[PDB]
């Protein structure tokens, strides 16, 4: 019944995911740090996204990925509940996984792998049913699923960007703007539907998007083109939550 609903969501949402943020971890009661075991080898990584029967994990390069290859691309992971507890009660049993895919990328002169891992036995049903509900909301595009990061003294310190200064380009002209908020999928900027390019100085990152709201200086809401978002931007937002 619950099992059946989870099987239906598995089929419906094959290939889809929910990116992690503070509010998602809170809802799911799932810590974002996770231990992988490959025989007696062990390493901690961070969850990037979760799906109905798989999840994506970030590790440093030259750690888990070669270790998995030596073990026929099988390992086990331990999900923990969203607390600092060291009690047995905070942990789910280790679950068997198999590596489906991996990519390589850079951050701050350090190299990382993003690993897609499939559960070889049922994920905890309490988590699976909530991931399916989040995927229903993502499909609908009727309400927000993630928090937006408001740009202020505290968040600018945590984000790996230097300031609130950015640029908006549209109709062959580039204007200054101030970033007011950021999220995985867009931004609100202030300055003085249309296609545009949002950019800011970084290690200039350019993101193509479309206007969604304007209101009066002018506050402009932007939806980044969903299939084109630079991995470096996505990881900047993920880093903020981690």
Ligand X SMILES: Nc1nc2c(ncn2[C@@H]2O[C@@H]3COP(=O)(O)O[C@H]4[C@@H](O)[C@H](n5cnc6c(=O)[nH]c(N)nc65)O[C@@H]4COP(=O)(O)O[C@H]3[C@H]2O)c(=O)[nH]1
Binding residues for ligand X (CB under 6 A): 141-145, 148, 181-183, 185-188, 212-213, 221, 223
How far apart (Å, rounded) are the C-alpha atoms in residues 1 and 170? 51
Nearest-approach distance from CB 28 to Cl ion, in angstroms = 13
Q: Does 238 bind Cl ion (CB under 5 A)?
A: no
- Is there a binding annotation on residue 148? yes
What single DSSP character describes residue 227? T
34-68 b/e with 16+ CB inside 10 Å = b?
bebebeeeebebbbbbbbbbbbbbbbeeebbbebb
Q: Can you read off the two tokens belonging to residue 65?
A: 């990925």
For tokens 């230097």, the residue is 162
- Is there a binding annotation on residue 185? yes
Q: At what angle do helices 125-140 and 2-12 cross, to 10 degrees?
A: 40
Closest residue to Cl ion, based on beta-carbon distance: 19
Q: Which does 182 bind (CB under 5 to 8 A by kind): Cl ion, ligand X, none?
A: ligand X
Q: Does 19 bind Cl ion (CB under 5 A)?
A: yes
Q: Which does 19 bind (CB under 5 to 8 A by kind): ligand X, Cl ion, none?
A: Cl ion
End-to-end Cα, the chain, rounded Å: 35
Nearest-approach distance from CB 19 to Cl ion, in angstroms = 4
Nearest-approach distance from CB 12 to ligand X, in angstroms = 19
Nearest-approach distance from CB 67 to Cl ion, in angstroms = 28
Q: Among 129, 105, 125, which Cα is nearest to 115's?
A: 105
Binding site residue list for 3',3'-c-di-GMP: 144, 148, 181, 183, 185, 212
Which chain residues interact with Cl ion by CB under 5 A?
18-19
Binding site residue list: 144, 148, 181, 183, 185, 212
């Amino acid at each position: 019944l619950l099992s059946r609903k989870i099987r239906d969501y598995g089929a419906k949402y094959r290939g889809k995911e929910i990116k992690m943020s503070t509010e998602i971890n809170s809802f799911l009661n799932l810590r974002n740090t996770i231990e992988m075991r490959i025989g007696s080898y062990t390493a901690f990584g961070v969850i990037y996204s979760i799906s109905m029967d798989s999840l994506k994990l970030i590790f440093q390069e030259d750690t888990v990925l070669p270790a998995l290859a030596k073990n026929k691309n099988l390992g086990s992971i331990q999900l923990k509940k969203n607390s600092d507890s060291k009690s047995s009660a905070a942990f789910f049993p280790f679950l068997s996984v198999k590596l489906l895919s991996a990519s390589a990328y850079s951050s701050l002169n350090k190299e990382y792998n993003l690993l897609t891992l499939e559960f070889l036995s049922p994920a905890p049903e309490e988590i699976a049913i909530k991931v399916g509900k989040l995927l229903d909301l993502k499909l609908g595009q009727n309400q927000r699923i993630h928090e937006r990061i408001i740009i202020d003294k505290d968040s600018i310190r945590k984000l790996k960007i230097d300031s609130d200064k950015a640029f908006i380009k549209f109709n062959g002209a580039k204007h200054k703007c101030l970033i007011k908020d950021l999220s995985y999928g867009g931004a609100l900027v202030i300055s003085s539907a249309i296609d545009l390019i949002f950019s800011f100085e970084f290690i200039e990152i350019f993101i193509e998007g479309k206007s969604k709201s304007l209101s009066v200086v002018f506050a402009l809401g932007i939806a980044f083109d969903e299939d084109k978002i630079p991995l470096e931007y996505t990881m900047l937002i993920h880093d903020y939550f981690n």
